[PDB]
Design a protein around this ligand. Structure first.
Ligand SMILES: Nc1nc2c(ncn2[C@@H]2O[C@H](COP(=O)(O)OP(=O)(O)OP(O)(O)=S)[C@@H](O)[C@H]2O)c(=O)[nH]1
Ligand SMILES: [Mg+2]
Length: 316
């Protein structure tokens, strides 16, 4: 029996790690389960396109083609259908034309100025597939969904002859108060950090850098004596998004003293060091750091294999 607690700021990837466990260890979302996420996929897709359209007003970005102004009207008239799990051909076309507009694209590429789901491009690039008649979410479509965690989610699986129980709580500021309900009997903490959050600010507070907030939480948890004998595992998550992001958005927005290059390896290492240096007892307490892409089953499989090895060797 092994108890794992997923901790981390909102949108760090915790509940996506929980889904991956189910996919790799259990054996995938059945068709009935996938159909359940259909409305979440459509909801996430419509919320994303609306969020970009909303930001265009704040940021005074015009559509590239004026004809999109009528698509944007039709978008709101037809959007309620999507919430119910339906997607007409008319609604797909509207969203597609919007998504292809150069003004909409200009605003998409300015998304750190507002709040936009990580999976916006992923669904929006796949409209023709997700809008098809009788669409059923794939495993990846399910992994990509975004729903806020309220409460405490418990999942169970078997791996390497061990019974895992995995606990997942919300990481938004409003849910932090509930972390303490999970602190008993923990074999290991998996602390998730969104690597690509370095240039973002909190949904709950525009003046707080997302990665700074993540550092404060890690500092708190990592140095809590209650957890002296709990294995502390750090997942530096969203490394795929990070990779892309680091090429065009300076790390100095987050860490003004960063002197390295705008490259994946140097910047990833630096973030790791910033987090591991919050450890106040480095000679007595080890952090196990892994760099992850939560949505990628092959990455999470091999990483969780290594994590389990460590838990197996250290607890017993
Ligand atoms: N591209 C990419 N997307 C990811 C990765 N990890 C998570 N995501 C996506 O990020 C979004 C947020 O992930 P999620 O699992 O909900 O975070 P969370 O920690 O559980 O968020 P919370 O508010 O309830 S506490 C989801 O849409 C998910 O698919 C990743 O490694 N790469
Ligand atoms: Mg969660």
């Amino acid at each position: 029996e092994v108890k794992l607690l997923l901790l981390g700021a909102g949108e760090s990837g915790k509940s996506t790690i929980v889904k991956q466990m189910k996919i790799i260890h259990e054996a995938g979302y059945s068709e009935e389960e996938c159909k359940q996420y259909k409305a979440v996929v459509y909801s996430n897709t419509i919320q994303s396109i609306i969020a970009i359209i909303r930001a265009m007003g704040r940021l005074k970005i015009d559509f590239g083609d004026a004809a999109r102004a009528d698509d944007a009207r039709q978008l709101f008239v037809l959007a309620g259908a999507a919430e119910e799990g339906f997607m007409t051909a008319e609604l797909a076309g509207v969203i597609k034309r919007l998504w292809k507009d150069s003004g909409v694209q200009a605003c998409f590429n300015r998304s750190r100025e507002y709040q936009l789901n990580d999976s916006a491009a992923y669904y929006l690039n796949d409209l023709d597939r997700i809008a098809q008649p009788n669409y059923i979410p794939t495993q990846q479509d399910v992994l990509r969904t975004r729903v806020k965690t309220t409460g405490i989610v418990e999942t169970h699986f078997t791996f390497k002859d061990l019974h895992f129980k995995m606990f997942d709580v919300g990481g938004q500021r409003s849910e932090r108060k509930k972390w303490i309900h999970c602190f008993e009997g923990v074999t290991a903490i998996i602390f998730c950090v969104a690597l690509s959050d370095y240039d973002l600010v909190l949904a709950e507070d525009e003046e707080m850098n997302r990665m700074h907030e993540s550092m404060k939480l890690f500092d708190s948890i990592c140095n809590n004596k209650w957890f002296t004998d709990t294995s502390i595992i750090l997942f530096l998550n969203k490394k795929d998004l990070f990779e892309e992001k680091i090429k065009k958005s300076p790390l100095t927005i987050c860490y003004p003293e960063y002197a390295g290059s705008n490259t994946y390896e140097e910047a990833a290492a630096y973030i790791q060091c910033q987090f591991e240096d919050l450890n106040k007892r480095k000679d007595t307490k080890e952090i196990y750091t892994h760099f992850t892409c939560a949505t990628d089953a092959k990455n999470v499989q091999f990483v969780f294999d290594a994590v389990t090895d460590v838990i197996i060797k250290n607890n017993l």
